[model samples]
Target chain A: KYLVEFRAGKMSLKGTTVTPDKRKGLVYIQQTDDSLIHFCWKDRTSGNVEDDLIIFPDDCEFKRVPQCPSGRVYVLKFKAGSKRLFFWMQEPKTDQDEEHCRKVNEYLNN
Target chain B: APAEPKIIKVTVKTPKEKEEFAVPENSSVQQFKEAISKRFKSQTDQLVLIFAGKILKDQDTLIQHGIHDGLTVHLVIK
Candidate 1:
């Protein structure tokens, strides 16, 4: 398995492969700017050549729901063996002092 | 009242970033560009807006193109 690095502000995360499940073509895991993480999968049952995918963010952290912002960069690390993608948001230095969680929750509701 | 103009959500996508905006129904395509310019602080001429594989002309209206409420408009720098 190979690792992919996504670097932002002050934090960098190394994502590794967990396992392979071909029943699902591609899998994606992402962390939102609000510090909420989610996992989604695409499967053949969706009736489209491309897999139908859905994202489920952590409810506890994202009690109000969260949405991705436009300018933030997302880094995807593809693991062939597991047919999965791992991702993480590069944590920003200023994030420590901001009310990002509230902003993210509001965005998702809209 | 003018029958509450539809509020369409527009999303601009690019390899590096994606941005979204909401516009009133009667707004012209040029107005959309103006909004983008204000948000990015860049000249409108530097960006190209596309919907359903076709380039959007400045004079076109969202309603004329059959845009839906939640449709996403993609923008790319050409």
Candidate 2:
């Protein structure tokens, strides 16, 4: 399965009405096309954000990654420095693409 | 002339114990992590040094993060 999920920041806890004070639905990214990566995150409150998904291009560089932590976490930095996006990939033992970090670097580079 | 790296003490708080180190001003966060990882005998992955209620990143130096001498940053090994 695609093991991408939100680690933190403005996300909703499933099975209940509780959302983090700072933010939404669990943040995840989807590639709409060759050029755009769509960010889908739920609103922190009782409503959904209208077209809330922000699209990012391939050229946005990863400024810094403090730590990977089990080879699952990604801290993405963009031009706007207010908030950094945190993504988690919880994969099973039988991962087809086991070298996920290398794959990510390749994906970002290409 | 290259500026002399400022020497200052920083305390790292792990669950078992707290220890202080004399850190250089120009040491990169990644450099610090590489050394600190040896201290904890842990990998740099998932090991974050937290201070001022925020993450102290690997790319930022102690001076860049505005961390002062003798200040303590908690080691979050999660």
Candidate 3:
């Protein structure tokens, strides 16, 4: 029951916003009614596009990268089909960085 | 005969004209684009060459994508 405004793209795409690892981009995800995890991104026009998107099937595998040098960072990789999506959730830098990571797992596992 | 490095026939289509070239399959897509850039006055970066739905990667050789002889590839401005 949460909504996230990506702040740049004209995406009203609610669900959860998951941060990618060691990179600069936001991947918005939503588990659809069909039990498929739908993934989408903001296009180069700074708008949310439903097309040219990829969908990873449910019941995918998971891999956890316990501790990098970042200190108590929650990092895990999920394999959907042949593609591996890695999420670096926690940060030693600030509270918001870790918060963004924590809430995503709740929705994903829920 | 040095076994003649697989002479691959490629079809190049532009907005204005269409032509065919017989080049070596060992050549990379970048090399292919660079070779024709002068003839078409085309900037290689601005050109996107696709075969079916597969987007051609520059570093990959023609053989990598099973681009054998007589296979046609589509080109467009991106």
lDDT of 1 by residue, B1-52 (tens): 5855678766665444656677787767777778777887666876666553
lDDT tens readout by residue for model 3, A11-42: 22235554433332344655545443444443
Using TM-score, rank the candidates from best to worst: 2, 3, 1
For model 2, the stretches where C-alpha displacement exceeds 4 angstroms are A1-110, B1-5
| lDDT by residue (tens digit), candidate 3, B1-78 | 475577877766555666888777666677777877877777888666645434555755666663665665656554
Q: Which tens-of-lDDT digit does each residue in A1-110 have in candidate 1? A: 10111222211234643332334232333445633233333333562333222222111122211243533322222111112232223345535222443443333222
What is the TM-score of chain A, computed separately for every candidate? 0.21, 0.39, 0.41
lDDT of 2 by residue, B1-78 (tens): 976678877777666777888777876787888887886787796776755334566655675653575666656543
lDDT order of candidates, best first?
Answer: 2, 3, 1
Please report, in order, the local distance difference test score of every candidate based on alpha carbons.
0.42, 0.51, 0.48
As a TM-score, model 3 comes out at 0.39
Model 3 clashing residue pairs (backbone): none
